[PDB]
Each structure stands twice: as C-alpha cells, then as structure tokens.
Amino acid sequence: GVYTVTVYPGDPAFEIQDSLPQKIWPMLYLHQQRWLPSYGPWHIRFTSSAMQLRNFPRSLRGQANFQNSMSLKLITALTDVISRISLDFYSDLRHLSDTMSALCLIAAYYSEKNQTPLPTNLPELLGNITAKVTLLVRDLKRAAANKGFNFNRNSSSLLPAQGGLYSNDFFQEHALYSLFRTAGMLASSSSPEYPRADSVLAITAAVFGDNIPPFAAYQWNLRSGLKALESLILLFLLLDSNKRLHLEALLGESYSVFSFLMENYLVPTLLHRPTTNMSALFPGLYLLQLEFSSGASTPHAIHLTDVKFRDIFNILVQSNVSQELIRAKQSLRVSCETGSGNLLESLSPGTTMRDIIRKEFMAQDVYDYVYFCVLGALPVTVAVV
C-alpha cells in the first residue's frame, strides 16, 4: 500500500511505497541528453574511488559515474546500504526495531517527568514526539556535563553475551543511560533505590506483547534504542538563505521544522510501516555519523573513513558464492554508533554537523539539512556536454 509524506512546510507531498529517496532517484534520469544528477563532494569521491576498486560490481559502473554523476543503479545501491545500517539482519522475537525501542524509552521518560499515563498502542506511542525530544534535550544537558555518549565495548559484536547482558561497565559512562537511571528507569535486582514501575516494560507489553523482555535484562534493545534516540537528538540539534536543493528544477515546475518533519514524515511512515529502522527514516544522519566516526573532520581522517566505507560497501554489494559480510554490516553499524556519540560529545553538536554537511554534502540551510537527512544526498542538475 502506498502512503503520503511531506518533508518541509509548504513543500509538495510524495506518495511512496517504502523509501522517499528510492522514489526520487529514478525521476532524475528522464532527461539524460540535457542533464544528469550530481550528488555532491563526498558522493563524487565515493564514486571515483569505487570506479578504481578491483572487486567493484560491474552492474554499478554506468556511464553517469564519469559525468560528475552516479548511475541510477549505484545511487540505488548506496541508498539501500545506508538505509539498512540499523536494520536487524536476524529474526528474534525479543527484538524491537531501533526506532520503537527509542520511542518506548522517550515515552517512559516523558511520563515519569510529567506523572502522566503511559501509551497503550502505536498511535499514542507516536504522539507528542517534539515535546518528548524537547524535554529530553534540555534534561540531557545536565547528564552530559560529566558523561559521554559512547559505550565501553568488548569485541566488535553487536549482541550481548548468553543471558542478555553486556559487560557491567558497558552503559556506565553513557549520559542518556545515566539520565534514565536518575529518573528511576531500568532498575535491577542490584539497584540501590526502591524500584519504581518499569514504564518501558509496561509500554512494550501493551503495544508489542510479552516477547519483549525488560531492557535492563535483555540489553540489546537498550543499546539499540539509545543509539536510535541519539540520532533523533542529533536531528533535533541540526534543525535548531540560498539553498542547494531545487525540486522544481529536478522534478518539474509542479513540485518548527523539526515538529513538521515529525508529524508529516516520521509519524505517517511508522503508521504505515511500523518496523522502519532509524537509518531508513534518516539515512543522511547515518552518513554524518560515519563522517565523524574517527572523532575528527581533517582530510586525513575523512580519507581513512572513506577507504573503510568503500571496502565495506564493496563487500555488501558482492554477488559471489557470509561471516565477512556479517562483519562488514556490524562494522558499519558500530562506526555510525561511534560517530553519533562523537558528535554529541563535541562542544556544539549542531555546529560540527553543519560544518560537515556543508563541506561533504554542500547543504546550505535548514531546508537542505532536512532533505539531506531524509534522502542521503542533495542532487543538482548538471548539463550533459
């Protein structure tokens, strides 16, 4: 079933089957003798280095790659890889999508701070997202004064040990985990305070059922939800005169900012596609996270990141007759988690993100930032000569 989304106020509405950028990209190849789409600096270097890789799939080597453009197959493949970064590759009854885990965590916190009832279904869980994020961003400043946003990891595997728990110190130095603990959330058998009701479990039991265990007992949903929540906070901070993206020129003359995006893009997407993962909602945010995964934006650090991503992309798009593939998916996901924590640890997350998005993706204002987050690229028309 097709559904409708609007990304920016006053802008046209789009009817999509699953992904907005996947709906847009084919429309940019209907005037190939007049113009081709150009996707920006990071995309041109990525395409250029992919055309030099020995193992690079031949199906993604179209002529457009050499005309300051990308072939439709290559931009589609890249959009797919980025959208699948935070997607669970396995089936597990205990697992929620990262998006739903973040939504349960943020609704529990909002309920505890305002002494208001918990949501009991999907539409209530999707309500007042802007106020929930606003409360979380203002309260988080207190917790982030002495704590960072990166996990204390042991191995590059994403899942916890048999039993459901990570190492005792895994979440210890995380500001968002600490903020939830100060509010009485995620209590355990060894917690020092008199335990309050587990509001996250009451939400999961009501909306999803009995298969979702407590986040403190089966900690994969907590690791997953915390990083999806960091992505929503980074989106809030990024959106808080001339533009690169011109829809009239690309598609035809017929074609707060955060709150509008929530109500007209995020909420309609999750009502029609409830399992949508965070990197599929906001692929551009995951590219920004990948760019800051080393904790630096120097061309040396950017180059090393770009080499690492191109090798990962290469493995993910291979068609050759599986542990190497799993390792690559996990490595890309962990690099984005690291990048996300790094951005939030910077003095001004919004400024750091704005500097990166302007240099690597040529976004010029809030209009371009929102579209970059949803599409993963900001295409421009380039004349064919």
Residue numbers in the entry: 105 to 344, 351 to 365, 384 to 449, 453 to 516
Please quote the authors directly.
Herpesviruses cause severe diseases particularly in immunocompromised patients. Both genome packaging and release from the capsid require a unique portal channel occupying one of the 12 capsid vertices. Recent symmetry-relaxed cryo-EM reconstruction strategies of α- and γ-herpesviral virions provided first snapshots of the unique portal vertex that is essential for DNA encapsidation and release. These studies revealed for the first time a pentameric cap on top of the portal that presumably seals the capsids against DNA leakage after packaging and has been proposed to consist of pUL25 in HSV-1 and its ortholog pORF19 in KSHV. Here, we report the crystal structures of the CTDs of pUL25 orthologs from 3 members of the β- and γ-herpesviruses (HCMV, KSHV, and murid gammaherpesvirus 68 (MuHV-68)), highlighting their structural conservation across the herpesvirus subfamilies. The overall structures of the HSV-1, HCMV, KSHV, and MuHV-68 orthologs are well conserved as reflected by high z scores resulting from structural comparisons using the Dali server and in spite of a low amino acid identity within the “twilight zone” (approximately 20% between the crystallized fragments of HSV-1 pUL25 and MuHV-68 pORF19; illustrated in the structural alignment in S3 Fig).
Similar to HSV-1 pUL25CTD, pUL77CTD and pORF19MCTD crystallized as a monomer. Pentameric portal caps have been demonstrated in α- and γ-herpesviruses; however, neither HSV-1 pUL25CTD nor MuHV-68 pORF19MCTD are pentameric in solution or in the crystal, suggesting that additional triggers or stabilizing forces are required for pentamerization. The crystal structure of the HSV-1 pUL25 CTD displays a remarkable charge distribution with a number of positively charged residues on one face of the molecule (blue in S4A Fig) and a cluster of negatively charged residues on the opposite face. A similar but more pronounced polarization in the electrostatic potential was observed in pUL77CTD, whereas the corresponding surfaces of the γ-herpesviral orthologs did not reveal any accumulation of charged residues. (E) View on the MuHV-68 pORF19 CTD (pORF19MCTD) shown in surface representation with residues conserved across all 4 orthologs colored in yellow. A larger conserved patch consisting of 4 residues distant in primary sequence (colored in orange) is in close proximity to the loop connecting Y365 and S384 (black arrows), which is disordered in the crystal structures of all orthologs, suggesting that the conserved patch is likely buried in the native protein.
